[PDB]
Structure formats: C-alpha cells, structure tokens
Amino acid sequence: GSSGSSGNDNRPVFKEGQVEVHIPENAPVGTSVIQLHATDADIGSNAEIRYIFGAQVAPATKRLFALNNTTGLITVQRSLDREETAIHKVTVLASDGSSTPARATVTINVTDVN
C-alpha cells in the first residue's frame, strides 16, 4: 500500500517452558531426548538462534548430552549413570537479537534397564 513498517523488538518462544522425559541410562547413543523449536516471526527469518548452556550447569552433563547450539536439539552423547545422578536438569537459552534470550527448563528422569 502506502506505508510499510516502522520497526520494533521481537523474540522467539519455546514450545513448552518445562517438560519431563523418561530415558534409560543404557539408552543407545544418538537418541533424541528433547527438541526445542523456537523460530522468530514466521515472516522473515534472517537471523541465527544459538542455544547455549544455562547457568550453574555441570560439565559432565555437557559431555553426557550433546546440545546443538544451532538447533537446540538434545541427544544422547555418551552412556549415562543412574547410581551417580538420577535427575538431569538442563536449561537452554535462545538468543536471536534482543536484550536477553528465553530460558527453558528440561527434566530428564533416568529409568532402570533390564
């Protein structure tokens, strides 16, 4: 028409704030635990959303689980241990181009293995 756009701030949104999952410690390497889909305004996607590790995140979790800083997908990276840890609390942060990114909690319950 006549006028186009003015300009404003905009941030993505996670599918679900917190979600509980049940995966066996012996689970096979390469399994997809949880996937966070947070794309900016449908119209126009000229940005790069990176998913980093939240605050107070143990290193072991980073190795045991591989978090893609390009898609934000979490998949089994190495064998896990129940005896040591039973519940895994990992937080993901998506920053496209705003003041502060969005935070998302993810609880992973380790189930025994026959």
Side-chain angles (χ1 to χ4, degrees):
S2 174
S3 49
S5 59
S6 308
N8 67 45
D9 84 59
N10 90 285
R11 43 271 173 157
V13 55
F14 283 111
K15 210 178 205 67
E16 288 276 54
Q18 81 287 116
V19 190
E20 281 89 90
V21 298
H22 65 291
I23 178 199
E25 62 81 0
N26 202 22
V29 174
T31 314
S32 70
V33 190
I34 183 157
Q35 168 80 91
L36 300 167
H37 205 250
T39 51
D40 323 273
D42 305 277
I43 184 154
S45 295
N46 294 357
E48 58 208 53
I49 297 167
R50 271 53 200 291
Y51 309 95
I52 48 173
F53 283 89
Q56 274 296 285
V57 174
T61 304
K62 303 186 172 191
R63 182 165 186 175
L64 288 178
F65 290 91
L67 159 77
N68 280 11
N69 316 41
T70 34
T71 74
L73 154 66
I74 296 165
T75 57
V76 173
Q77 199 191 322
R78 278 180 86 73
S79 282
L80 318 160
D81 312 279
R82 203 280 296 278
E83 278 196 276
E84 195 273 327
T85 181
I87 298 164
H88 273 291
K89 283 203 162 198
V90 177
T91 312
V92 176
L93 293 165
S95 84
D96 153 30
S98 72
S99 306
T100 50
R103 67 169 156 75
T105 311
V106 177
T107 315
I108 310 153
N109 287 241
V110 179
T111 63
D112 278 315
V113 275
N114 179 293

